[PDB]
Design a protein around this nucleic acid. Sequence first.
RNA 1: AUACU
RNA 2: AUACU
Lengths: 219, 219, 483, 483
Amino acid sequence: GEDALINMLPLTLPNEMYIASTTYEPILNGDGPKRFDWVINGGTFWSFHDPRTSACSEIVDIDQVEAINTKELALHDDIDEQNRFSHLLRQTLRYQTDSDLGWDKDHKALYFRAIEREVSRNFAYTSSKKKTDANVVSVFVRHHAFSPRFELMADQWYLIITPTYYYTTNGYAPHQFAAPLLAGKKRLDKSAALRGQVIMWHRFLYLMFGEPPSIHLDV
Amino acid sequence: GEDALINMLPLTLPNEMYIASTTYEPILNGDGPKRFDWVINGGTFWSFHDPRTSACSEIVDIDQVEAINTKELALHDDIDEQNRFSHLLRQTLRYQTDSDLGWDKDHKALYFRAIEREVSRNFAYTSSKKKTDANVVSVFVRHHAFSPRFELMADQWYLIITPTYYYTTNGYAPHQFAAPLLAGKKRLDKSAALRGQVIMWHRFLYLMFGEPPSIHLDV
Amino acid sequence: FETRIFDEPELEFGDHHHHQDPRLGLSEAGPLQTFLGDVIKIGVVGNSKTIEDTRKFIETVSSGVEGKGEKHPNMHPPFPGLGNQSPYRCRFEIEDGATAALTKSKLDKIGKEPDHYRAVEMAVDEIIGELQAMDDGGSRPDVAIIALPVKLLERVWNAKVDARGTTEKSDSSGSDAPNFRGMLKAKAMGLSFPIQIVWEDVIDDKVTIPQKVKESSSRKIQDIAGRTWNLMTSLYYKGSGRIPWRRMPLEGEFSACYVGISFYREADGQQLFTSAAQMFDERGRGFVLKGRRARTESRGRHPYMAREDAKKIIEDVLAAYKLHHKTLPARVFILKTSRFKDEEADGIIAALDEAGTELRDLVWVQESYTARILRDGNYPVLRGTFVDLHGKGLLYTSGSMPYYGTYPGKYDPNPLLLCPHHTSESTVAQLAEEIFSLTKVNWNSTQMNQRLPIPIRAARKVGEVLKYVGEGEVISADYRKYI
Amino acid sequence: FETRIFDEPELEFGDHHHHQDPRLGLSEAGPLQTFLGDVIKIGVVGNSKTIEDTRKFIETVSSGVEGKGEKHPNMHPPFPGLGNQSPYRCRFEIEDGATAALTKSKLDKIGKEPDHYRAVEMAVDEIIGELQAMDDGGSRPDVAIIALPVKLLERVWNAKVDARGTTEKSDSSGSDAPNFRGMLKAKAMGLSFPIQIVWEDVIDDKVTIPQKVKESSSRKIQDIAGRTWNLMTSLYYKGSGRIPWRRMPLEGEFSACYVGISFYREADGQQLFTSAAQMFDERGRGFVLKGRRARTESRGRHPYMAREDAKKIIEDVLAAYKLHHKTLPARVFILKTSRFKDEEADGIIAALDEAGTELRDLVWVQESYTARILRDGNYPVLRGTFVDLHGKGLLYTSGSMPYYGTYPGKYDPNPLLLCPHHTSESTVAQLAEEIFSLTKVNWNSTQMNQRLPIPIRAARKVGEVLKYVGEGEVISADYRKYI
RNA sequence: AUACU
RNA sequence: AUACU
Ligand SMILES: [Mg+2]
Ligand SMILES: [Mg+2]
């Protein structure tokens, strides 16, 4: 009845992991799709789903694929395996929406990429009650973003989304000569803005993200 | 005399400093010249030369200017004063040629600006022998840069420049997916290219930079 | 999952009175029932103006101020007289001779040197010599209000905010700057005076604080009745040796030891990680027990007690508990705001193994972790927010308040970590309840807000004071020398 | 500015012979003096194949190899025999019955575990156990070769490069990785065993190194003649306690003490910056004297000696000098990796004011300056170039070589910031010359190059060894236990 | 350093 | 950990 949203995504993964081994320190560009990045582990190669016989980027040696299920390897007890797997998940999430979303090194954000100058695009997603739009190219330029974080919680795997409003700086320039402008917009009323920014974020959607849990009791 | 070049740039400064004090700490904009930069010391709004009545962009306190000679504050025995003067000179240098030189927060470089994509703006400058051209807009896009540093050295206020290629990022693609292309192929012979790239950087030429010293014997 | 939101615990006031805010509980019942001395001598040290208006402050609240504001009468009750109805049943008496002046030349000579360390050093040393000259005889100055003039205030604050000190995650002391408060409390440790440091903004808000001090500290003081509520309570706490209010445990009383393992740094030699117990028992006494050099993982960072170090620390905590009371601790609650190493946990377990009916209770806390939960609002209680995240028990204990009517914070709440060790024989719910029973027991304030429990909150104060206590010096386990 | 390019320092070789290349000086004259009692027992520890081909490879170089390459004959002279043409004139024989075996099951049990620390820990313990079972009686093994098989090699190297250790500038210990070399030298300190650690590539050039070890270490051996030049010299250095060469300057021939103050963290407790002397006199003896818990500026970083600590450390350096020779130092040189603080410098002046005729000088050397002075190149000499920066003497010693005929490096040189203190009584050129005189005394090598002089070059080795020596254990001032 | 977030 | 950069 009094349930509320949760800022992490219940990832659903198939029974295929494609464990391998390489020698690299993470990208040699590529010649095909945008899934030719160095999505590797610390010493070994941890790839993901692929429509080819070889793994991603075609740089790992042939006949060195374990091809084991997710439950055998991704569920470990030491924190080093969790950190490695979550870094891999962040790497395969950043280069998954590369044609639409960009990543910046400061503040750790996946923002909307600008197509031109003085953009007037709108993002619309469906809902059960009505249709709600969002303007993410507002110029006074800033767009919308989020930050991913690591979480396992034993049974499943999670990417934590923090909806930063990204009001400071956007465009081709890295920073508008260090000129930020932001304040507190969200409030602890019956509704909120951050959760809203979580709900209307759908550009992140074999990383088949489930809906955030939103099951709570507040007696 | 087997003289060799040094990569330090002497500074010639007028007898005006306009020391003041206002509560500010880093960049307001929208008034006049791009020189609306918070040239901010450790608690004192000590800016540089004042063309109008009020320093910078009339942000500083009007009735607090000092206008002292160069030897009063540029020469000091305290290392903290030298570091503050170095930071102030860096802030004046970065925001002086900002119409055609950009600054990046990583690697600390002042690189050439790109007007658009697929740039054809190779830089030609005159020398004593003949006109020397440089491919500062090379596309395979990378440009030319330098990293600045300041120190006093007990007689002047030299600026040290490290002539590094840009080799990464630029405006065509934000960060080229974390993939530089470089080899560090510099030459150790009777001549070099770092001395070259120091000489063919005339884009910083009030912060009137003198010629680099190049007074050596080298027996 | 399952979301648990706990209620406010019961604070004991006076003689058998229930729980309210620490101000309202300390207005109808007063402090605890123990026939101690009813006279506290409050000999003020400062110049003539600060001593004069401190005496005017004591005179003007003996009748009672009626300051209020906003709309909620629960948040800002007034502070009535100090001498007629007074809950402490105490005389806030000031005597001549103890009021020792600082003249004007010495204030200028300590406010004119541009060195940040040296200025606060002489400001500490001159008044320490003044208190030593007070200690020889004449009266019994149980406390000493340290009133700071505007020049001294600006000097000792700009020595802190303009020294460009850095912070650290596991350093439980502060931000590396020269602290006037910690230095005064450290150099007054050998003294017999629990001292109180005030400003003149607390006394009279007629002199303006300079703009640099206002902007660099974000200073916005409360009303007249709201400023003497957190000061006279701290005055009665220091000069009597009695705690004003008593917390009440829930899951069995017996004996308890909520020892807050923290690792401060002392600015004497190598900036050691010599650690501190900061033990708080079931009633609230701050048994401060520093130990030896706790081991570090790499380059002097990420500290942890070694196995021998952990059993020695727990042994001196048990020694302090058995010295104060004739009963061994039936439960020891380690509260680290960092992860538990296996060697440290094994040492603590081996030390607890020689205790009858023992109860090891280990909890991991980590600061600056980003996972916002219960995405709702004020209506759904938001102070006691805690969700069982399948093992780890992330909790933020600050937010919207019932019985207030508004959210007192100006920013969004931030969470910490609550992860029990695998050796702990308790669920995350009962350890969460014990974290949310370490509430409203800070003697530095009368607030009912909380984001750090007092073994975690008091770590900052203990590391503030024990930063400037040199090697080979006996320290005090009495909590009156810290806050 | 004015630029001085000093000449190469010379060395003394044999009985009254001048300086050639350090291999060439160690091929026509040999070691320094006292060519009597030429017995060295070189009892090897390893498996059967490794001991067998170690003895075989010693047998090949006993006649003399003729390896050469490239074009310059000065850089790659051949390695002579071990008989009549032996430069050391010493018995390089293996002690019979001192071939301590490691079998095969123990090697697999070390190489199979996934712990980086524990594998090298029990490898060190196994080697130490065989050395302790060797030194009980039977013969006199003056030196020992710890020859490592490839299965042990990959394990002890990937325990280091895959441990993800960090670095810091003021520390000389290395990079926090478990070091096989440092741990073996620390646990062999109580022994009478100077020990040499080799790889299977040095013995036989037939077994391949795995690609992970090749890429993670950039391993590229030289020829057979160029591989045993750096090994048998280190073998003779660690036997009989006699250095094979010395410098011959004329500035301070009465007394000299180039005490290279550096700071290291010891991985026993808090990784405290317990400091070391690393004193090198006018001949090159490495008097290693660990100091005390030196004060740090902030949070355990930027160490400096306290005034009492500085005077105590200089006092024990003077005590070591007066123990070895019947003359107090008169030319104490301090060589720090950071700028001199006022307290440390004042402590050093206070300690040295007790001594006699003082020509004391202090020099700051700061790594990684950004001013590429003297943009001339190879045809003028770039090794040993510095610029008088109106008080500072910014210097790099790495560059082009006249005798080599080519630039031996693969990257551009990076300089050091030579800054004399204001109490130094000598010009910057004299201090630069004295730093340049500390070049070819590296007993870890047999070539002519420098980027760090041996009071700073030896800081790495001393902090490597003394990282693991525990508290309360007596350390050795003999430099044989470090390189 | 009257307090808290 | 054969050595240097
Ligand atoms: Mg208080
Ligand atoms: Mg060696």
